[PDB]
Amino acid sequence: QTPTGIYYEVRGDTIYMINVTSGEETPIHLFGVNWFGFETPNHVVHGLWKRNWEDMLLQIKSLGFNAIRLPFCTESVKPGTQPIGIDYSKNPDLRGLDSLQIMEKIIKKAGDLGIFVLLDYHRIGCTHIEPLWYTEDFSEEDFINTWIEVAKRFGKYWNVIGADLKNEPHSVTSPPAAYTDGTGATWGMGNPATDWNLAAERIGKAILKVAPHWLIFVEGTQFTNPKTDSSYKWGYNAWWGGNLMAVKDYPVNLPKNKLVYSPHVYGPDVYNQPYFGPAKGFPDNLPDIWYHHFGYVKLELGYSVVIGEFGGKYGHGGDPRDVIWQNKLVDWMIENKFCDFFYWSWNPDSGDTGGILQDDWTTIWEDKYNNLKRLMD
């Protein structure tokens, strides 16, 4: 039931932490940020050439966040992988540690601060996000076995809440080809080798056997099947990991008390969507679009929906509509009680969105942050 004393579960659309000895249950809310880098060639969260790792976590907590989504790639979790680009005058207690041991130390430190950790298997290699949870050289079985290994080790950390099974299932060709060509993820197509809804069941079953106290976060794909995508005018314009329109007719076959749907949603800095045009109704058209792409999964179907990435430059060397976009998304999350989320990103070094920190790795964007803080209170 649990190697830590704590068991996480969803009841309706809310996540709970259960102390299994005392029987006590407390609803939790994830006020979260992404701190990325373990899924990259650095093999460590970024910024440690400019900051001490613990000070960063203190800074994160001081801003009211209580959760971190931690991307990793396969190699970062294998013992013996070396990190690159750490300033060790600033991080002397990292001297000698490989990527995995830095990950343990960070999660343990986060735990000491009450901060929840969502582990996110973000890339299989360490360069880019594959459309599928396998590659020519890395099979599904390999992918699953890595999760089992990660689950065995990190399931012993009280604050690790579970597994975001694969970052951004998506496509690399257009429809209608993308539905059948084998190169990109689908949902509801029928083929269990491309259908992310089916694979999520296989992979989450395997993790729940070794970490039964975890949550399984399942993201959207980009396209699902042609009937579902055609049923909505903006069906073909959801984000990577952002299309959950198929959940209704093709729900992932896992225990409802262990499952969280986790869409990503982005503004004009990531892609100049046609629906960001004022001529097409922006920003007042947005609630309906979010509602169709993912928000009905909570508001109509009653599942927990935790937005696993959203963000943008908020008018700092980006498209100024992003300010309007982020305000309207925060308003809508607040109106509809989407109170669980992970902002992308803590890091400034995200080329199309920037982050909460500015390029100095030290100072925050006060305005971007103040707008988000409304979710936190």
| Tokens of residue 236, six digits | 């073909």
Give the Cα separation of 127 and 11 in Å (integer): 37
The answer to whether 168 is annotated as binding is yes
Give the Cα separation of 73 and 373 in Å (integer): 30
Phi then psi for 35, rounded to 5 degrees? -115, 100
DSSP letter at 127? S
Could you tell me which residues are beta bridge partners of residue 301?
none
Of 107, 118, 35, 38, the C-alpha closest to 74 is 38
The answer to whether 377 is annotated as binding is yes
Could you tell me which residues are beta bridge partners of residue 182?
none
Could you tell me which residues are beta bridge partners of residue 116?
67
Neighbours of 270 (CB within 10 A): 24
Phi then psi for 323, rounded to 5 degrees? -60, -45
Catalytic (active site) residue 130? no
Angle at 311 between CA 348 and CA 261, to 5 degrees: 125
| Method for structure elucidation | X-ray
DSSP letter at 333? H
Which residue type, as a one-letter code, is found at position 36? F
- Catalytic residue of the set 130, 168, 201, 219: 168
- Are 31 and 73 in contact by the 8 Å Cβ rule? The answer is no
Phi then psi for 309, rounded to 5 degrees? -145, 135
The answer to whether 339 is annotated as binding is yes
- C-alpha pair distances (Å), 283 with each of 3, 179, 234, 289: 47, 31, 15, 10
Number of residues in the chain:
377
- C-alpha pair distances (Å), 171 with each of 140, 179, 197, 354: 17, 9, 15, 24
Give the Cα separation of 347 and 53 in Å (integer): 12
14-19/6-11 β-pairing? antiparallel
CA 126 centroid distance within chain: 17
Give the Cα separation of 361 and 53 in Å (integer): 12
21-41 per-residue burial string, b: 16 or more CB within 10 A, e: under 16: eeeeeeebbbbbbbbbbbbbe
- Are 2 and 19 in contact by the 8 Å Cβ rule? The answer is no
| Domain range summary for the chain, segments of one domain joined by + | 1-377
The answer to whether 340 is annotated as binding is yes
- Can you give the resolution of this entry in Å? 1.9
The fold of 1-377 is: TIM Barrel (3.20.20)
Catalytic (active site) residue 168? yes
Q: Burial, 71: exposed, middle or buried (Cβ in 10 Å; 0-12, 13-18, 19+)?
A: buried
- Catalytic residue of the set 9, 201, 219, 309: 309
**DSSP symbols for 34-99:** E---TTSTT-S-TTTTTS-HHHHHHHHHHTT--EEEEEEEHHHHSTTPPP-S--TTT-GGGTT--H
**DSSP symbols for 182-235:** SSS-BSSSS-TTTBHHHHHHHHHHHHHHH-TTSEEEE--BS---HHHHHTSTTT
**Sheet architecture: strand order including 116-123:** 304-305, 259-261, 215-218, 160-164, 116-123, 67-73, 31-34, 341-343
Give the Cα separation of 164 and 300 in Å (integer): 23
Neighbours of 144 (CB within 10 A): 19
Of 167, 177, 158, 187, the C-alpha closest to 253 is 187
- C-alpha pair distances (Å), 101 with each of 96, 107, 109, 119, 251: 9, 10, 12, 15, 37
Q: Burial, 2: exposed, middle or buried (Cβ in 10 Å; 0-12, 13-18, 19+)?
A: middle
Query: By three-state DSSP, how is residue 107 classified?
Result: helix
Of 146, 102, 97, the C-alpha closest to 122 is 146
Locus of tokens 């998304």: 329
Query: By three-state DSSP, how is residue 26 classified?
Result: strand
25-28/14-19 β-pairing? antiparallel
Half-sphere exposure of 316 (CA within 13 A, CB side): 22
The answer to whether 352 is annotated as binding is no
Could you tell me which residues are beta bridge partners of residue 72?
121
Q: Which residues contact 73 (CB under 8 A, 6 or more apart)?
A: 38, 39, 40, 43, 121, 122, 123, 124, 125, 126
